[PDB]
Amino acid sequence: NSFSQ
Amino acid sequence: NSFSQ
Amino acid sequence: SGFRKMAFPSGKVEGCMVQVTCGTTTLNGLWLDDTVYCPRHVICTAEDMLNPNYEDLLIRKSNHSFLVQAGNVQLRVIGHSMQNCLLRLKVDTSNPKTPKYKFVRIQPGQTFSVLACYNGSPSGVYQCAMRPNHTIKGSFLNGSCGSVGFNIDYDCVSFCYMHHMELPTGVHAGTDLEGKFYGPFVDRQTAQAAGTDTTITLNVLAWLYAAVINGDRWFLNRFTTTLNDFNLVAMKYNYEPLTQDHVDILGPLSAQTGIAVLDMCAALKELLQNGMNGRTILGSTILEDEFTPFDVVRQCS
Amino acid sequence: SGFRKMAFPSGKVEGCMVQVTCGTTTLNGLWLDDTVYCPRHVICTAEDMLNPNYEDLLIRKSNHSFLVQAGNVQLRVIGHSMQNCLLRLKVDTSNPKTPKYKFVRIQPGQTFSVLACYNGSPSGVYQCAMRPNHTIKGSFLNGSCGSVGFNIDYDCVSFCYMHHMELPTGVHAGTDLEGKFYGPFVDRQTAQAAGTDTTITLNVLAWLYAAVINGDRWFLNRFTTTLNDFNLVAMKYNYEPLTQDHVDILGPLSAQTGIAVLDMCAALKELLQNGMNGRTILGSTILEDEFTPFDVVRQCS
């Protein structure tokens, strides 16, 4: 779930 | 024929 | 002739990229006059995700905390506020190389160039579109955050995108330069999906007008259809409905090739119905929705 | 993740573009130290085509004749010689913005970025490959001549292409920066064809290694094949033969995904045999030969 990159 | 551009 | 996906020359933007670090996090940032913009999500670590309060996490941060590198050099932070999802960081210097420019919110359908950076330096530039489901298809690796989207109009740079995160689907999400996210997304780490997308019907049509103008012509047909009859089909195949404003826009392209829009639509209607029995339209074997009518104009004639 | 055709950031080159005029002809030119390079074909008018002698036409030319614009400003010509198909024009100034750089001759298969200009200013940048039949698929309108091709390696700009002409097929032809044309082409206006092309088998394979590494995996199969058995098929479908040096190159990509090259080839062999029964590999519905193994590395990991 998600991926703050 | 051709196209010198 | 020829027709390739083209990105604005990245020069003017290259000179606005800087690197930002806050603890165990490094991401890129954009430096305009004495300001530096970047995704607030810099100031979190990876338990803060789950549930961060930004107003909270930020009130315990000094400019001491913020390491700004412009190449070898470094910049002091002075002020620092927050705009929705972005930090505005005042710095001791206006950028020598700051160009004319604005901040526009692009709309789903319009396209823009992306300059992809890592550690405050750029490594690549590519053209893409602002999807109808509000995300985008980029190539983005960790540390890509801070990378910007943008157009050029004569000399002024219209800024419209800053990259914040990648989704479970492998697509990307981000925000304009006011901090307001494109789409229904937020900085947290939560159950989050790219809502099912559709195809930019205005575009595919600009794209067919390319093929023609370039000389490719096999997709056309004698028929026409009402607008309403076109949409009924377009829905089935998961395309956006075509509206009159759309039909207006295609005005000059029908006026250059001399092909009525509603005719084009008949062709497209036919193309959806039949596929291509395997054959090329301007290179592709699929229908290409990432060109604006406007980009088929810049680039064709 | 994600995977898009990416072009090197055009910044360093933007600042080397100038405009050149000689009579009723205007085309772009490239300005390195006190030098400016461009296609000799500037100094002809459109009866000179048929049969120009360049050594002849050039001996009756003064630096008076050559108008060089760098933005509003203008540059004096001092010397001027000729290298095969290019004029080397000495000028009163070395370019402030001249970067580190070299002049390499790329080989069919390798790729490069193209910065497309008109009237000595750039308007667009796109990535493409140096085709096996020696031409390229660009987007080039009249006045595009002078536009350059190039890579970046750390900080140095490897120059490898300058655009001279478009062919009857709509493809483009040009030269390295020594003046030597890529392929069997010459500055005249004669009966001239793009010899029938083939597919960059090394590349398609780098491209499959993308799909996999990105996570797409449906194309693979338990089989293997000799090298020689692979080629027999690859020829039928108009692909280049795969050699051992090729197979070496793919080394680290098989080492990252853990898939033997000769296995990949079995998959490709199968892919040629069967098509896709209509389905996506990393976005496309056709097999994509314009990625180097090396570009799948820069961009993936």
Q: What is the residue whose two structure tokens read 């995300």? A: C135
Contact present, D94 and D127 (Cβ < 8 Å): no
Q: Do D164 and B5 count as a contact with CB atoms less than 8 A apart?
A: yes
Cα separation, C181 vs D262, in Å, equals 46
Q: Under a CB-based contact definition with an 8 Å cutoff, are residues D155 and D54 in contact? A: no
| Chains B and D contact (Cβ–Cβ under 8 Å for 3 or more pairs) | yes
Residue with tokens 């028929």: C223
Distance CA C4, CA D128 (A): 9
The closest alpha carbon to D163, from D148, D152, D143, belongs to D148
Burial of C131 (0-12, 13-18, 19+ CB in 10 A): buried
Q: Where are the beta strands (DSSP E) in D167-298?
A: 172-175
Q: Could you please report the per-residue DSSP string of D262-274?
A: HHHHHHHHHHHHH
Contacts of D68 (CB under 8 A, 6+ apart): D18, D19, D20, D21, D29, D36, D74, D75, D76, D77, D89, D91
Spatial separation of the C-alpha atoms in residues D108 and D64, rounded to whole Å: 39
Q: Quick one: which H or E segment has residue C29?
A: strand C25-32
Flag whether A touches B (3+ CB pairs, 8 A cutoff): no
Q: What is the dihedral of CA C96, C102, C108, C111, to 10 degrees?
A: -50
Distances (CA, A) of C148 to C142, C174, C214, D228, D253: 15, 9, 32, 47, 30
- Are D1-14+100-197 and D15-99 in the same CATH fold? yes
Q: Could you give the CA distance from residue D274 to residue D212 in angstroms, rounded to a whole number?
A: 19
CA atoms within 13 A on the CB side of D214: 25
> Taking CB atoms and an 8 Å limit, are A2 and C140 in contact across chains?
no
**In chain C, what residues touch D14 (CB-CB under 8 Å)?**
9, 11
Residue at C12: amino acid letter = K
Give the CATH architecture of domain D198-301: Orthogonal Bundle (1.10)
The H or E element containing residue C265 is helix C261-274
Distance between CA atoms of residues C62 and C46, nearest Å:
20
Neighbours of chain B (3+ CB pairs under 8 A): D
Q: Which of D145, D163, D165 sits opposite B2 (nearest CB)?
A: D165
From the options 2.60.40.420, 2.40.10.10, 3.20.20.100, 1.10.3720.10, give the CATH code of C15-99: 2.40.10.10
CB D209: neighbour CB atoms within 10 A?
24
Nearest chain B residue (CA) to D26: B5
Closest C-chain CA to A4: C165
C-alpha C182 chain-centroid distance: 10
DSSP bridge pairs for D172: D136, D166
The residue of chain C nearest to residue D124, with distances taken between CA atoms, is: C8
Pairing of strands D121-129, D156-166: unpaired
DSSP letter for each residue of D142-185: TT-TT-EEEEEETTEEEEEEEEEEE-TTS-EEEE-TTSPBSSS-
User: Are A1 and C144 a contacting pair at CB < 8 A?
Assistant: no
Q: In whole angstroms, what is the distance from residue D200 CA to residue D132 CA?
A: 7
Inter-residue contact C128 to C112 (CB < 8 Å): yes
Q: What is the CATH number that goes with domain D1-14+100-197?
A: 2.40.10.10
Nearest to B5 among D140, D168, D192 (CB): D140
Q: Which residues of C are catalytic?
A: 41, 145
Residues 237-296 of D with CB under 8 A from C: 283-286
Question: What's the CA gap between D128 and C245, in Å, rounded?
Answer: 35
Q: Which residues of C2-28 are buried (b: 16+ CB within 10 A; e: fewer)?
A: bbbbbbbbbbbbbbbbbbbbbeebbbb
Chain D residue numbers with beta carbons less than 8 Å from the beta carbon of B3 are 142, 165-167
Rounded CA separation C9/C229 (Å): 41
Q: CB-CB: which of D6, D140, D285 is closest to C124?
A: D6
What CA–CA distance (Å, rounded) separates C106 from C113?
A: 12
- Any idea what DSSP says for residue D7? B
Residues in chain B: 5
Closest residue of chain A to C167, computed from CA coordinates? A2
> What are the helix and strand counts (H, E) for chain A?
0, 0
Identify the residue whose tokens are 């193994």.
Answer: D293
Method in brief = X-ray
User: How do C101-103 and C156-166 pair as beta strands?
Assistant: parallel
Closest CA to C127 of C144, C108, C113, C140: C113
What strands, in cross-sheet order, belong to the sheet with C17-22? C73-75, C67-70, C17-22, C25-32, C35-39, C86-90, C81-83
Q: What is the CA radius of gyration of chain B?
A: 5
* A-chain residues near C172 (CB < 8 A): 5
- DSSP 8-state class, residue C164: E
CB pair distance less than 8 Å for C140 and D1? yes
Domain chopping of chain C, boundaries? 1-14+100-197, 15-99, 198-301
